[PDB]
Amino acid sequence: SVTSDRTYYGYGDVSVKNEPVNVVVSPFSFPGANASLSSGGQGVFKKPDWIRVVNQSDVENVKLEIDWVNANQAANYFDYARILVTGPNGQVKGYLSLQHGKAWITLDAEELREGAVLGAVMYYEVKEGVLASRLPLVFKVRVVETG
């Protein structure tokens, strides 16, 4: 009588919700307070706690691409500007200048285990006589690959 259609089923579901990374930012105001910057002046500014990376319990490798997009603008104001991106635990993984504007800071599973804080060190010299107020520098952070 009944000729059973021999076909049973099994199923499953996978939930991919979050993105691997969170770039929490604390922007810098470099002349700061209780310090001063003059026109034509030379020196160094540093912020130790600038870009924080927070990852899920699953992600263990990240490769970030930092990009300086308005570098053609700060060229009209600065003579040399060299940004050093201080890595997790004293490592320095990044270097940005008016000429060379792309960095490739990558992070491993030991560094992500304790929170990757990316401070910034800046070496500068304001072009001769230029006087400005609240100049912006904007950096593009791209997560290129992860695992």
Identified binder of its own copies from the candidate list 31, 37, 38, 44, rule CB under 8 A: 44
Which residues is 27 bridged to in the sheet?
A: none
CA distance 92 to 94: 6
Identified binder of its own copies from the candidate list 50, 55, 71, 116, rule CB under 8 A: 50
Identified binder of Ca ion from the candidate list 92, 110, 115, 142, rule CB under 5 A: 110
Residue 35 near which of its own copies, Ca ion, none (CB within 5-8 Å, type-dependent): none
Contact flags string 13-32 toward its own copies, x per CB under 8 A: xxxxxxx--xxxxx------
Site for Ca ion contains 3 (CB under 5 A): no
- In residues, how long is the chain? 147
CA distance 25 to 49: 9
CA distance 146 to 10: 31
Identified binder of its own copies from the candidate list 98, 117, 119, 123, rule CB under 8 A: 123
Site for Ca ion contains 108 (CB under 5 A): yes
Site for its own copies contains 84 (CB under 8 A): yes
Greatest distance between any 2 Cα atoms in the chain? 99
**Token duo for residue 30:** 């470099």
